[PDB]
Amino acid sequence: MEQQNTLNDIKQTIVFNASIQKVWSVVSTAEGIASWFMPNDFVLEVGHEFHVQSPFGPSPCKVLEIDEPNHLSFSWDTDGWVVSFDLKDLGDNKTEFTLIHGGWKHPDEILPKANAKSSIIRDRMSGGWVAIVNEKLKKVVEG
DSSP, X not given: OOOXXXXXXXXXXXXXXXXXXXXXXXXXXXXXXXXXXXXBOOOOOTTOEEOBOOBTBXXXXXXXXXXXXXXXXXXXXXXXXXXXEEEEEEETTEEEEEEEEEOOOSTTOBOTTTOSBHHHHHHHHHHHHHHHHTTHHHHHHHO
16 A cells, blocks of 8 residues: 655653643653653753763753643754653543654664664664653653
């Protein structure tokens, strides 16, 4: 019939037993995130950039947009990636979580530092993200 084109944005749609407020709290803190991301001093500020502590080198970030009552966006420095966490108010103490992580466009290009097929990192990152999304995060929200 047809095949997919371009690089799809790592989408992770899942429904947790929490509220958009709680789910947001998991994606609007320093300790909460660090509980499923990395040790850093998160900063809820627009155009605010920080630095995290990774065992594989420091990786700063830069907030793009801030909207607790919806979602937020931020870029990834020393890498060239973007991770945005969407939130949907479902109710009944439930909320829809959608992890969107892109960076590349066409399946072929290559980024520095990493230097590897974007499609490879997409799966590599997606996988770990999938688990993390259904490993710590879940434990974070549920916890």
